[PDB]
Design a protein around this ligand. Structure first.
Ligand SMILES: CN(CC(=O)O)NC(=O)C[C@H](N)C[C@@H](O)CN
Ligand SMILES: [Mg+2]
Ligand SMILES: [Mg+2]
Ligand SMILES: [Mg+2]
Ligand SMILES: [Mg+2]
Ligand SMILES: [Mg+2]
Ligand SMILES: [Mg+2]
Ligand SMILES: [Mg+2]
Ligand SMILES: [Mg+2]
Ligand SMILES: [Mg+2]
Ligand SMILES: [Mg+2]
Ligand SMILES: [Mg+2]
Ligand SMILES: [Mg+2]
Ligand SMILES: [Mg+2]
Ligand SMILES: [Mg+2]
Ligand SMILES: [Mg+2]
Ligand SMILES: [Mg+2]
Ligand SMILES: [Mg+2]
Ligand SMILES: [Mg+2]
Ligand SMILES: [Mg+2]
Ligand SMILES: [Mg+2]
Ligand SMILES: [Mg+2]
Ligand SMILES: [Mg+2]
Ligand SMILES: [Mg+2]
Ligand SMILES: [Mg+2]
Ligand SMILES: [Mg+2]
Ligand SMILES: [Mg+2]
Ligand SMILES: [Mg+2]
Ligand SMILES: [Mg+2]
Ligand SMILES: [Mg+2]
Ligand SMILES: [Mg+2]
Ligand SMILES: [Mg+2]
Ligand SMILES: [Mg+2]
Ligand SMILES: [Mg+2]
Ligand SMILES: [Mg+2]
Ligand SMILES: [Mg+2]
Ligand SMILES: [Mg+2]
Ligand SMILES: [Mg+2]
Ligand SMILES: [Mg+2]
Ligand SMILES: [Mg+2]
Ligand SMILES: [Mg+2]
Ligand SMILES: [Mg+2]
Ligand SMILES: [Mg+2]
Ligand SMILES: [Mg+2]
Ligand SMILES: [Mg+2]
Ligand SMILES: [Mg+2]
Ligand SMILES: [Mg+2]
Ligand SMILES: [Mg+2]
Ligand SMILES: [Mg+2]
Ligand SMILES: [Mg+2]
Ligand SMILES: [Mg+2]
Ligand SMILES: [Mg+2]
Ligand SMILES: [Mg+2]
Ligand SMILES: [Mg+2]
Ligand SMILES: [Mg+2]
Ligand SMILES: [Mg+2]
Ligand SMILES: [Mg+2]
Ligand SMILES: [Mg+2]
Ligand SMILES: [Mg+2]
Ligand SMILES: [Mg+2]
Ligand SMILES: [Mg+2]
Ligand SMILES: [Mg+2]
Ligand SMILES: [Mg+2]
Ligand SMILES: [Mg+2]
Ligand SMILES: [Mg+2]
Ligand SMILES: [Mg+2]
Ligand SMILES: [Mg+2]
Ligand SMILES: [Mg+2]
Ligand SMILES: [Mg+2]
Ligand SMILES: [Mg+2]
Ligand SMILES: [Mg+2]
Ligand SMILES: [Mg+2]
Ligand SMILES: [Mg+2]
Ligand SMILES: [Mg+2]
Ligand SMILES: [Mg+2]
Ligand SMILES: [Mg+2]
Ligand SMILES: [Mg+2]
Ligand SMILES: [Mg+2]
Ligand SMILES: [Mg+2]
Ligand SMILES: [Mg+2]
Ligand SMILES: [Mg+2]
Ligand SMILES: [Mg+2]
Ligand SMILES: [Mg+2]
Ligand SMILES: [Mg+2]
Ligand SMILES: [Mg+2]
Ligand SMILES: [Mg+2]
Ligand SMILES: [Mg+2]
Ligand SMILES: [Mg+2]
Ligand SMILES: [Mg+2]
Ligand SMILES: [Mg+2]
Ligand SMILES: [Mg+2]
Ligand SMILES: [Mg+2]
Ligand SMILES: [Mg+2]
Ligand SMILES: [Mg+2]
Ligand SMILES: [Mg+2]
Ligand SMILES: [Mg+2]
Ligand SMILES: [Mg+2]
Ligand SMILES: [Mg+2]
Ligand SMILES: [Mg+2]
Ligand SMILES: [Mg+2]
Ligand SMILES: [Mg+2]
Ligand SMILES: [Mg+2]
Ligand SMILES: [Mg+2]
Ligand SMILES: [Mg+2]
Ligand SMILES: [Mg+2]
Ligand SMILES: [Mg+2]
Ligand SMILES: [Mg+2]
Ligand SMILES: [Mg+2]
Ligand SMILES: [Mg+2]
Ligand SMILES: [Mg+2]
Ligand SMILES: [Mg+2]
Ligand SMILES: [Mg+2]
Ligand SMILES: [Mg+2]
Ligand SMILES: [Mg+2]
Ligand SMILES: [Mg+2]
Ligand SMILES: [Mg+2]
Ligand SMILES: [Mg+2]
Ligand SMILES: [Mg+2]
Ligand SMILES: [Mg+2]
Ligand SMILES: [Mg+2]
Ligand SMILES: [Mg+2]
Ligand SMILES: [Mg+2]
Ligand SMILES: [Mg+2]
Ligand SMILES: [Mg+2]
Ligand SMILES: [Mg+2]
Ligand SMILES: [Mg+2]
Ligand SMILES: [Mg+2]
Ligand SMILES: [Mg+2]
Ligand SMILES: [Mg+2]
Ligand SMILES: [Mg+2]
Ligand SMILES: [Mg+2]
Ligand SMILES: [Mg+2]
Ligand SMILES: [Mg+2]
Ligand SMILES: [Mg+2]
Ligand SMILES: [Mg+2]
Ligand SMILES: [Mg+2]
Ligand SMILES: [Mg+2]
Ligand SMILES: [Mg+2]
Ligand SMILES: [Mg+2]
Ligand SMILES: [Mg+2]
Ligand SMILES: [Mg+2]
Ligand SMILES: [Mg+2]
Ligand SMILES: [Mg+2]
Ligand SMILES: [Mg+2]
Ligand SMILES: [Mg+2]
Ligand SMILES: [Mg+2]
Ligand SMILES: [Mg+2]
Ligand SMILES: [Mg+2]
Ligand SMILES: [Mg+2]
Ligand SMILES: [Mg+2]
Ligand SMILES: [Mg+2]
Ligand SMILES: [Mg+2]
Ligand SMILES: [Mg+2]
Ligand SMILES: [Mg+2]
Ligand SMILES: [Mg+2]
Ligand SMILES: [Mg+2]
Ligand SMILES: [Mg+2]
Ligand SMILES: [Mg+2]
Ligand SMILES: [Mg+2]
Ligand SMILES: [Mg+2]
Ligand SMILES: [Mg+2]
Ligand SMILES: [Mg+2]
Ligand SMILES: [Mg+2]
Ligand SMILES: [Zn+2]
Lengths: 112, 101, 116, 59, 140, 154
RNA sequence: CGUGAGGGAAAGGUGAAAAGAACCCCGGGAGGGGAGUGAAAUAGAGCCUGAAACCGUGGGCUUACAAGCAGUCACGGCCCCGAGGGGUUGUGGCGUGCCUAUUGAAGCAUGAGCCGGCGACUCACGGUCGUGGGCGAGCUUAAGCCGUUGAGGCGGAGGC
RNA sequence: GUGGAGCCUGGGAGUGAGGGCGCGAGCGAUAACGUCCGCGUCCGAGCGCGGGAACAACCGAGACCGCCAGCUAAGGCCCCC
RNA sequence: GGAUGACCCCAGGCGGUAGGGGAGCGUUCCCGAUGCCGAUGAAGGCCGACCCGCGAGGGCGGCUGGAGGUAAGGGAAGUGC
């Protein structure tokens, strides 16, 4: 049994969040919570909410046990980028891409 | 007991029971053909000069096929020369039945 | 009427990309880089088909030569031997004999020696 | 200077090999002897406020 | 029929006494042994050659004035880093290197040719330590 | 490229912008630009020789005649403009709808009656043409129609 | 966008029907997980199909003594599908991108980041060969006219 | 001498920067990967194949496709090969 | 050879840039079509180690897709990057 949460269109660049997600992949829910709590990254806030929301789904919707949950899979996909104009010298305009993330946490039950 | 036979401009080591694909033989499937013998080995060793006189290898022609397609492709640079040719070499599949001598 | 590209160019591009499956980096992903790789691939295949016939013969010849020197002669003398004897077993089968049927190969050495 | 510029696009392989050093190391944590909660060593425990066995901080 | 390829065989260890033999004319044969080209099942893409132990490498022989005139050469990568060492001194300092350099040059280039060189065991002096693998003496 | 809405302004200088040289955006190299040799209003008609159409018209009828697919009639019995009436008549004449029929008659009532039949193309005799004869498997004609046909290939 | 004359875009598609997802759950929200609707919800409004570049997660094979236009030929190994095949690639052989322009380019000469779509020999009227037919000392109509409403006929002025 | 010979009529071209090499000269200095003609050749268009270490035009030879068959060419046959 | 393209045999040719010629494939549209295929699934998409074709391609099968598509034979071009 699996329980999933997806935070779509989070306004953080995928590459940067993936760093944080990479940390908790394959971890127990409890270790992941602890790791996230002291990860000095903006991304740790968002991953935490998805982790935490995936947990709730496991318990509330999916007859899974909180004491048994681990991060089965987790990944970040790119959402549509917010393109923004960055004014440069000599009349030139760059386009900054304020990138966007879809954050997915999938929890499984580690039995016993 | 094996034999070195010649068919299709090539030579082969054959033994009874061996399935062999050779160059296409003009022969209806099911039929049998006698292959020339260059050498005999195993218990007797007889050496053709070039082919041993009384000897043959009886082979049943299982049927005729076409090889898996090879893409023969030619390219010449800076000259717009390109050629794409599909080749399927025709073949005959033989069942080596017996070595006579 | 208007006959726009539509479905066609994509399909041709797919034919080429499929042929390029396995190729490194863009050479399997980019139609253009795949195209180019296949040109080389096609000639190489042609060249090497021809060159395979040479490779195997040179392989056989080395194997025959080793087997010959065990019996006291060299490849060139041996081949002149089978010639004078009128023995026509080719290097493909000679080399097989030299490994699988040393006794038969031994016999041919004798005949070769005898012929000169 | 004369504005140096990349000569070739970095291949995915060369790009991804640069980042072979980019993995975060997980926060190093120890259990607080008072409340058994996980926190960084050598810090006042944010869970119960204790450090060096005594209460140092409201939480 | 397809050409035979050998499943892996036990490599034959071999012993050669280099004393009084000509450097290059000996290297030839060691190189051939190393490749296993004396073997009827020779296969060019595997190492099925012999292991070759050579003793009295220090007593290898050389014609003409090559003792003083044959110069081994090393480049360090550094400005002016071309070092020159004559056969005389090479023999008087690292005699085994003389025969090693000869055989190495007559080996194929590439991974396999590098492995094959490791199968060469050259020794100055009459003795060798590979008594364990019991090398068969070869007259060459 | 000259009939398209855009201005004829050179969009950027010819040199030193590091971009491809262009003129106006009506150029066909531009998306939204003109089309190079696209269709223009055209007249596909041409004067096929009168003798040739006369001959073809003759040969088309002949072909049906040669198969026995040509039928002439004196009149059309109880068909007075009702489709069901033509159906009745058609049955009697061996026209069961199993084959397409080119119905050629100057009688307007008859044409009105057979007209809505899927298997019947209908024509006034002055309109006999080889396309319609070949399209259809059978030629059914007024004796009146047969005359103008005969005059026509006269 | 331009002082202005003027320049001048992009942007279509849920579903048969809103039945446009009550309510519960995590979340500040966004978002999501259930529930419900629907034939279909990877038709959920960022809505038909949903290619490619591109990014990522999982797996198979492989890779830290090896020298390169990245392939190709051979053999072996491993994995998969069920004397065969597919994937992978260890070693060995061979191997100077594509296009353009040139006497000559892998060329250290041009162009191209990559992908998708747009993108260049046409039409009219004359001409001239060839060709498929019609008629042949003759061939042919033009404009118009009548007819049709995807029906054809007339029209000999004129042209050759 | 029956050849992708030739002749005749007509349709369509492209080309009208050549280059190396051998031989015959001129120019140059009995210089030039020079230059300009003649005869030939090859590359051009045979940067396809073998040899020449590598290398358009030097030697060998004109690649319709396939073969894990054979003979040779130049060049080779101590090892790399 | 048979008897005019039925296929079969014999022989000889078949490197190729500019270029000439020939035979084909595919795209849009028209006649064929008041037809035919189609929810028992159109077109398109994603696969295929299968079949046919020298090739351009065409089939077939699985998945997707959800409503179109269109033969033999001809016709016409905004026809292949
Ligand atoms: C280190 N490896 C792998 C590699 O370099 O690709 N090296 C080789 O395999 C050398 C080998 N001679 C490459 C050839 O097999 C390529 N056809
Ligand atoms: Mg940290
Ligand atoms: Mg919970
Ligand atoms: Mg983004
Ligand atoms: Mg600034
Ligand atoms: Mg400014
Ligand atoms: Mg940018
Ligand atoms: Mg950018
Ligand atoms: Mg940017
Ligand atoms: Mg055959
Ligand atoms: Mg090829
Ligand atoms: Mg090239
Ligand atoms: Mg080209
Ligand atoms: Mg090129
Ligand atoms: Mg060229
Ligand atoms: Mg080309
Ligand atoms: Mg072909
Ligand atoms: Mg075969
Ligand atoms: Mg187009
Ligand atoms: Mg299109
Ligand atoms: Mg396309
Ligand atoms: Mg497609
Ligand atoms: Mg690919
Ligand atoms: Mg690969
Ligand atoms: Mg690549
Ligand atoms: Mg790739
Ligand atoms: Mg990659
Ligand atoms: Mg890709
Ligand atoms: Mg090719
Ligand atoms: Mg070939
Ligand atoms: Mg070759
Ligand atoms: Mg050969
Ligand atoms: Mg040998
Ligand atoms: Mg001979
Ligand atoms: Mg022979
Ligand atoms: Mg054995
Ligand atoms: Mg400076
Ligand atoms: Mg500077
Ligand atoms: Mg400065
Ligand atoms: Mg700078
Ligand atoms: Mg990657
Ligand atoms: Mg890097
Ligand atoms: Mg790391
Ligand atoms: Mg010796
Ligand atoms: Mg070896
Ligand atoms: Mg070897
Ligand atoms: Mg010496
Ligand atoms: Mg000396
Ligand atoms: Mg110096
Ligand atoms: Mg305008
Ligand atoms: Mg305007
Ligand atoms: Mg203007
Ligand atoms: Mg204008
Ligand atoms: Mg203007
Ligand atoms: Mg102007
Ligand atoms: Mg400029
Ligand atoms: Mg630029
Ligand atoms: Mg530009
Ligand atoms: Mg630019
Ligand atoms: Mg411009
Ligand atoms: Mg323009
Ligand atoms: Mg314009
Ligand atoms: Mg437009
Ligand atoms: Mg526009
Ligand atoms: Mg009708
Ligand atoms: Mg009809
Ligand atoms: Mg009608
Ligand atoms: Mg304004
Ligand atoms: Mg618009
Ligand atoms: Mg809708
Ligand atoms: Mg609607
Ligand atoms: Mg609620
Ligand atoms: Mg709440
Ligand atoms: Mg919500
Ligand atoms: Mg959720
Ligand atoms: Mg929801
Ligand atoms: Mg339902
Ligand atoms: Mg259904
Ligand atoms: Mg779907
Ligand atoms: Mg969708
Ligand atoms: Mg849908
Ligand atoms: Mg979208
Ligand atoms: Mg729709
Ligand atoms: Mg990618
Ligand atoms: Mg992965
Ligand atoms: Mg080393
Ligand atoms: Mg290693
Ligand atoms: Mg290389
Ligand atoms: Mg490689
Ligand atoms: Mg091999
Ligand atoms: Mg395999
Ligand atoms: Mg393999
Ligand atoms: Mg070579
Ligand atoms: Mg190499
Ligand atoms: Mg130029
Ligand atoms: Mg130039
Ligand atoms: Mg020049
Ligand atoms: Mg280069
Ligand atoms: Mg370069
Ligand atoms: Mg330049
Ligand atoms: Mg370049
Ligand atoms: Mg230029
Ligand atoms: Mg260019
Ligand atoms: Mg750019
Ligand atoms: Mg790319
Ligand atoms: Mg034209
Ligand atoms: Mg036009
Ligand atoms: Mg004209
Ligand atoms: Mg004309
Ligand atoms: Mg004409
Ligand atoms: Mg006539
Ligand atoms: Mg007239
Ligand atoms: Mg008049
Ligand atoms: Mg000719
Ligand atoms: Mg000629
Ligand atoms: Mg012509
Ligand atoms: Mg001209
Ligand atoms: Mg010209
Ligand atoms: Mg001129
Ligand atoms: Mg000139
Ligand atoms: Mg000249
Ligand atoms: Mg010339
Ligand atoms: Mg000249
Ligand atoms: Mg010349
Ligand atoms: Mg010269
Ligand atoms: Mg001379
Ligand atoms: Mg002169
Ligand atoms: Mg010159
Ligand atoms: Mg000169
Ligand atoms: Mg001169
Ligand atoms: Mg040229
Ligand atoms: Mg050449
Ligand atoms: Mg030539
Ligand atoms: Mg070159
Ligand atoms: Mg060469
Ligand atoms: Mg060479
Ligand atoms: Mg050369
Ligand atoms: Mg040169
Ligand atoms: Mg030829
Ligand atoms: Mg030939
Ligand atoms: Mg020979
Ligand atoms: Mg010779
Ligand atoms: Mg050898
Ligand atoms: Mg070589
Ligand atoms: Mg060629
Ligand atoms: Mg040709
Ligand atoms: Mg067509
Ligand atoms: Mg229709
Ligand atoms: Mg039906
Ligand atoms: Mg249904
Ligand atoms: Mg279905
Ligand atoms: Mg369509
Ligand atoms: Mg279609
Ligand atoms: Mg297909
Ligand atoms: Mg399908
Ligand atoms: Mg489908
Ligand atoms: Mg409809
Ligand atoms: Mg149609
Ligand atoms: Mg058709
Ligand atoms: Mg028609
Ligand atoms: Mg049209
Ligand atoms: Mg166009
Ligand atoms: Mg494109
Ligand atoms: Zn605490």
């Amino acid at each position: 049994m699996e329980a999933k949460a997806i935070a779509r269109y989070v306004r953080i660049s995928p590459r940067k969040v993936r760093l944080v997600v990479d940390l908790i992949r394959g971890k127990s829910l409890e270790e992941a919570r602890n790791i996230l709590r002291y990860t000095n990254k903006r991304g740790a806030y968002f991953v935490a909410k998805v982790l935490e929301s995936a947990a709730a789904n496991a318990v509330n919707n999916h007859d899974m046990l909180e004491d048994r949950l681990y991060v089965k899979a987790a990944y970040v996909d790119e959402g549509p980028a917010l393109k923004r104009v960055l004014p440069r010298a000599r009349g030139r305009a760059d386009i900054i891409k304020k990138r966007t993330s879809h954050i997915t946490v999938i929890l499984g039950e580690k039995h016993g | 007991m094996f034999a070195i036979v010649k068919t299709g401009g090539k030579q082969y080591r054959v033994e009874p029971g061996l399935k062999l694909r050779v160059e296409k033989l003009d022969a209806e499937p099911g039929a049998t053909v006698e292959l020339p013998v260059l050498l005999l080995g195993g218990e007797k060793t007889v050496v053709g000069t070039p082919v041993v006189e009384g000897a043959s290898v009886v082979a049943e022609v299982l049927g005729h096929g076409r090889g898996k397609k090879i893409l023969v492709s030619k390219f010449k640079a800076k000259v717009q020369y390109r050629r794409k040719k599909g080749h399927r070499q025709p073949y005959t599949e033989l069942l080596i039945k017996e070595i006579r001598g | 009427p208007r006959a726009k590209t539509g479905v066609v160019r994509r399909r041709k591009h797919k034919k080429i990309l499929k042929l390029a499956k396995g190729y490194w980096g863009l050479r399997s992903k980019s139609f253009r880089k795949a195209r180019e790789t296949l040109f080389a691939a096609g000639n190489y295949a042609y060249a090497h088909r021809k060159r395979r016939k040479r490779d195997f013969r040179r392989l056989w010849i080395v194997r025959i030569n080793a087997a010959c020197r065990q019996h006291g002669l060299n490849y060139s003398t041996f081949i002149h031997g089978l010639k004078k004897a009128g023995i026509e077993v080719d290097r493909k089968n000679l080399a097989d004999l030299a490994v699988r049927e040393p006794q038969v190969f031994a016999e041919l050495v004798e005949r070769a020696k005898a012929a000169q | 200077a004369k504005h140096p510029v990349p000569k070739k696009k970095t291949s995915k392989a060369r790009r991804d090999a640069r980042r072979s050093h980019h993995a975060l190391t997980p926060p190093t944590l120890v259990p607080c002897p008072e409340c058994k909660a996980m926190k960084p060593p050598h810090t006042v425990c944010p869970e119960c406020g204790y450090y060096a066995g005594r209460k140092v901080l409201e939480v | 029929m397809k050409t035979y390829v050998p499943k892996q065989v036990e490599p034959r260890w071999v012993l050669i006494d280099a004393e009084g033999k000509t450097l290059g004319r000996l290297a030839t044969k060691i190189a051939t042994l190393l490749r296993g080209k004396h073997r009827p099942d020779w296969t060019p893409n595997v190492a099925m050659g012999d292991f070759v132990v050579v003793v009295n490498a220090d007593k290898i022989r050389v014609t003409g004035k090559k003792l003083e005139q044959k110069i081994y050469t090393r480049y360090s990568g550094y400005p002016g880093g071309l070092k020159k060492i004559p056969l005389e001194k090479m023999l008087a300092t690292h005699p085994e290197r003389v025969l090693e350099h000869a055989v190495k040059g007559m080996l194929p280039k590439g991974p396999l040719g590098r492995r094959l060189f490791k199968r060469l065991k050259v020794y100055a002096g009459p003795d060798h330590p590979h008594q364990a693998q019991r090398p068969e003496k070869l007259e060459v | 490229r000259g009939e398209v809405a855009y201005s004829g302004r050179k969009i950027w200088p010819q040199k030193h912008t590091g971009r491809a040289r262009h003129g106006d955006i009506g150029a066909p190299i531009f998306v939204g630009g003109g089309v190079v040799f696209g269709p223009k209003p055209r007249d596909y008609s041409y004067t096929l020789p009168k003798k040739v159409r006369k001959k073809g018209l003759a040969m088309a009828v002949a072909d049906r005649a040669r198969e026995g697919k040509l039928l002439l009639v004196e009149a059309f019995a109880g068909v007075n403009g009702k489709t069901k009436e033509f159906l009745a008549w058609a049955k009697e004449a061996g026209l069961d709808g199993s084959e397409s029929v080119l119905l050629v008659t100057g009688n307007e009532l008859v044409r009105r009656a057979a007209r809505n039949l899927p298997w019947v193309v209908t024509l006034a005799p002055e309109g006999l043409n080889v396309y319609d004869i070949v399209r259809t498997e059978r030629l059914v004609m007024d004796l009146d129609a047969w005359e103008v046909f005969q005059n026509r290939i006269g």
